[model samples]
Target: GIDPFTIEPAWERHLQDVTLKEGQTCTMTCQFSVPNVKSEWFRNGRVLKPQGRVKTEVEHKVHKLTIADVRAEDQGQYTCKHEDLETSAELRIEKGELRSGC
Candidate 1:
């Protein structure tokens, strides 16, 4: 019998932690280390697509999720899920409230 369980790293830290101003474009990068699996990005538990401000990158076995021109409403727990034959990793994004004053 084969077991279906795995662990990986996703959404380690935000590239920037400053308070984002209104109408200011922002970018967020998520990194994950996965093996024998595919990784996907989700926002509020929904599948994310590569739009004008959303993009993805994959290198070796690492996955990156990028979001641009983020807004206040975009502040939430984004999740990254990796799935393979018998393993997966789910990461949560929890960096909110851009910093104020340098």
Candidate 2:
């Protein structure tokens, strides 16, 4: 018996923890061995979709997620998963300069 020729996507690069000030933008990036593949993003164990301040992009074997206007509440664990492979990173948001405070 013979099996179809295929390759399992191995992680070429793993995501690293990120720390940034609130109201700033942050990006979580990772890479996979295969160029043609799809993955899902999750935040605090919830599904994350590309919308508003949240966006995702893929170029060849690299995948990245951008979060704009990050807030203190945005601090959490983010996971990128594809099939049986997955990677995760922690996002920490620090307080930024006060705005419009009387």
| Poorest stretch of ten by lDDT in candidate 1 | 85-94
C-alpha TM-score for every candidate = 0.49, 0.80
Off by over 4 Å in 2: 1-7, 97-102
lDDT per model vs. reference? 0.49, 0.79
Task: Give candidate 1 regions above 4 Å deviation.
Answer: 1-31, 35-37, 84-102
* Clashes (N, CA, C under 3 Å) per candidate: 5, 0
Looking at model 2, residue 98 earns an lDDT score of 65
Tell me the tens digit of each residue's lDDT in model 2 across 1-102: 768466558786886788887677888888876785778988888888888778877767777889899887776688888878888889887554564222
RMSD of each: 7.4, 5.1
Which 10 residues in a row give candidate 2 its minimum summed lDDT? Answer: 93-102
In TM-score terms, candidate 1 sits at 0.49
